[model samples]
Target chain A: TKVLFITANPNSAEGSFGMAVGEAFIEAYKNEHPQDEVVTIDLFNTTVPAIDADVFAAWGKFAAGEGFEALTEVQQQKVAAMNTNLETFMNADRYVFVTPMWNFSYPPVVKAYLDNVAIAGKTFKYTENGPVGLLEGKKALHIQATGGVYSEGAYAAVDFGRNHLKTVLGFVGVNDTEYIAVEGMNANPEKAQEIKEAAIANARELAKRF
Target chain B: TKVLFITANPNSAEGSFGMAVGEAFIEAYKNEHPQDEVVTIDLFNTTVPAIDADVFAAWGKFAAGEGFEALTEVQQQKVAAMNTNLETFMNADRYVFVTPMWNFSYPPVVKAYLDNVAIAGKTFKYTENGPVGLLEGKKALHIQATGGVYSEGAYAAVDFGRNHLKTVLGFVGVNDTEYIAVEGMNANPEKAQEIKEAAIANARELAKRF
Candidate 1:
């Protein structure tokens, strides 16, 4: 099985505890399934370019495989890169998203990456009944961290990072998505290491079957 | 009063109904309070640049008014632009976010803008008790649009766009944030026009007090 490990943190796995958790999950998964291919896309280093009007128009043409050659070099290059990202996603069997909650949401780099892959007709298509996800039989794990508590109680309403990922993942046919979060570490600084260890243990356990 | 009108749509207000709703709201608000100054920041035309490691390092130096002159040209320019964005936000008495739900959240451009303005020791500051917002006595209106039904029912959990904006706004001391959404238009085309009109009416009414 192929596992696509997508991480979105400026500090990357080296600096961010959230990303370190994700790396731990991937490492554990690899230990058990050494034969499986694991591909990582570090969004911060790659800096997925933001989409604009021209890019959208170019994407439409490219997705339809019509008038793509006529597009400007800039648009063509962008669309091609977008297609490459989408292909990486399509080729994967399982997925892992490592992210840190920033300002009540995930980083814009993650959002940019999603914008490139979640294309109409490629990932999903609108039907007379409703929109149907084209990519099925794929499961995903979201490894997330937050400075504050937002996973339960009234604060849960403000949790856009994990909720947004789940919603978008479901929209694109990846409904079997699970999450492992380390939250409120900033609030309880003394127990931060203990909390992270617990999260790491969870990742290791999940990796056994993931 | 000064109202900061922030919009993030690739096609601008004309192509996006959510933005149009905001424009209409502004127009009505102007009709009522002609003396108020309304400044608009269209993220599509004025793309907010992404922040990186260098930007953060430069920002810390610049915020402390130390070693700012010695930074590289690229870092200095980025820090300057960020400062300008933060100043623009701080100068506004109120705010209006006109945005469309994209893949379960608002556009990356919107997130970029938020990242620029939601700065610590500027818009907010950390205290021993908790984070304290500096920009008090301000309110915000989030005029949002979604393709599916997410405002109510089980689908409400998927609505990260509005929920994220509300949370971030509250974090910055704009606790009196109001929302007006045009949702499920794609699912119920028959009521699309009706829903839009109703949203417009709501905007007009809100404009009177806002």
Candidate 2:
């Protein structure tokens, strides 16, 4: 199986409890499935491309069944590179998104990485009915950690971080997605370590079969 | 009034109905508020900084009462650029966000721009009570156009693009936000032009007071 581990928090190894939890999960998964091919894209360490006008135009032309040969060299190169990223994403059988909740959402670099993969006419196609995702029968796990509690209560609406990620991923045909949230570490400092350890243990168990 | 007009579509001038509608809104807003200082940030043409390790470290250090001078040169430059974006956002008396729905959400560039402005200590601060938005009494106009009918029915749950934007903006203290959606244009091509015209007319009316 091909597993894609897409992580965003750069400080995961540098004391970010969320990232550490994610790392623990990945380690356990790798330990259990040593033979599976794994591809990791740490967005913070990568040069994520911005979808500029040129690239947008190139995609539009391509969607319209036009060749890319007429595009400017820069635009052509950008489109080609983005296509490669999309291909890598589509090739994955199982996916793991390890991210931290930052300012009510995931990091912008995570979003940039998503943009490179969620290409129109590639991952999804527009139809008279609506936009349909091309990929199917894939399972995804979203492991997110937050400084405060946002999954419930009045503040829940403000947590576009998790819901937004879920919605976008589902839109791209990864609807069979599960979530594991580690939250309120800042609010409950005394229980921070305990909470993370519990989450890590849960991840370890899930990894045995995931 | 200082109006910050933030746009995310790369295809506005390239015959996208959503972009065209957004352009119409901006033009009408400008025509009505000729004296207001309108600043536009096109994310597609902009060099958006990623909130990577350096940025996270810088913010962490700053939150810990460390001075900016202790940061690396690259970190300093990134922080400075982000601060400028935040300042521009904070200075705006009114905000206008023009975006198109992409894979059930706004573009990654839109998220990137949001990351720049959604500074923790600057835009909102975490407190014992919860997170509190610093900016107050600001009104925002969200002009969004979608390729499908995501505003209603089963697809509504996946319409994270608009809801995510609204929630994040509201979290940062922009609570008085209004939305103008041009939806189902592509789903019903026969009514595409008519729907867009109605949206434009609505935008013109909104421009007078927005």
> Evaluated with lDDT, which candidate comes out highest?
1
> What TM-score fits each model?
0.91, 0.91
Chain B alone vs. reference chain B, TM-score for every model: 0.94, 0.91
Query: In lDDT terms, how accurate is model 2?
Result: 0.81
Give the least accurate 10-residue stretch of model 1 chain B, judged by summed lDDT: B47-56
Model 2 Cα lDDT, one tens digit per residue, A95-166: 898888876788776766777877667678877656678888788898889988877788777677688777
Pick out the ten consecutive residues of candidate 2 chain B with the lowest summed lDDT: B12-21
In candidate 1, position A134 carries an lDDT of 92
Model 2: per-residue Cα lDDT at residue B137: 72
TM-score of 2: 0.91
Q: For residue B5, what is the lDDT in candidate 2?
A: 80
lDDT of 1 at A120: 87
Q: Estimate, for each residue in A30-143, the C-alpha lDDT of model 1 and write its tens digit.
A: 999989999988887764657888787776776688787879888877777787889899889998998888788887888888887787888999998777789988999998
Worst 10 residues of 2 chain A by lDDT: A43-52
